[PDB]
Amino acid sequence: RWRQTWSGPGTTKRFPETVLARCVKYTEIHPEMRHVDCQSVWDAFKGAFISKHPCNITEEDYQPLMKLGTQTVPCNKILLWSRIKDLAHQFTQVQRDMFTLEDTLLGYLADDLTWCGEFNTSKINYQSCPDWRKDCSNNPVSVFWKTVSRRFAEAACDVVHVMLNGSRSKIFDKNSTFGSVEVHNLQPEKVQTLEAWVIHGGREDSRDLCQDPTIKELESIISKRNIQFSCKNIYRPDKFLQCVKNP
């Protein structure tokens, strides 16, 4: 009876039923993951935020889920992406030997969902959840993503690719999961190169977007961490998939 109203949307209706179904479907499509017990999964997921104040979630709260969700992703086939969701995923849907975070079990379970609980209650708060900006950054959803993202990045090796959106005011935005957590967690010991793919999209007349001020900045950040940088313009997205789809 002490529920505060938050500024963000409440938990996605049917969140529990959705996570379970997604876990079931996932293990169905990935036989290599059949060893996973989806009820345990949901339990560990739920345990990270239920009965807890939605502004004091920590990485450790998700550790049990992280363990039950351990998954071996060929480290040299990782595709990071920033604000270009749809194309990043149409890509791994074709080039199935490449993987984005949302292609892993955990990423698949939480994709496009919102959730939060309430202190000293077993109820899922469907009324409202903390908005990271207006309420607090350490809410169930944000903490979850920065945690799984950081782990995904840390596991990368060799050549890591990042899909970026050329149509954006800031093709490379420091203020984004990519720029604030993934790029700073790629290991120099494992990763030698970070290759960006800037996707063109009508923003302007065709030109070299790999010379963009934000891209130069990305290269600065990356180079500083002793990792080589490479950038490639993907001028015709439609022609891109097509050539990946029918080589």
User: What is the experimental method?
Assistant: X-ray
State the Cα–Cα distance between residues 126 and 14, nearest whole angstrom: 9
State the Cα–Cα distance between residues 121 and 99, nearest whole angstrom: 37
DSSP-derived letter for residue 83 is S
- Looking at the DSSP bridge assignments, the partners of residue 159 are 193
Which residues carry out catalysis? 75, 157
Domains, in order of start, for the chain: 1-72+100-155 (1.20.82.10), 73-99+156-247 (3.40.50.720)
Going from the C-alpha of 160 to that of each of 11, 17, 219, the distances in angstroms are 33, 34, 14
- Interstrand relation of 79-82 and 128-129 (parallel, antiparallel or unpaired): unpaired
What would the two tokens of residue 110 be? 């939480």
What would the two tokens of residue 73 be? 């992703």
DSSP H helical ranges for 30-172: 38-49, 59-68, 85-94, 105-110, 140-155
Torsion angles phi and psi, residue 109, rounded to 5: -65, -40
Q: Which residues lie closer than 8 Å to 115 by C-beta, 6 or more apart?
A: 11, 12, 15, 49, 124, 129, 140, 141
Task: Say how many C-beta atoms besides its own lie within 10 A of residue 25's C-beta.
Answer: 12
**Consecutive H or E run containing 199:** strand 191-199
- Interstrand relation of 128-129 and 8-9 (parallel, antiparallel or unpaired): antiparallel
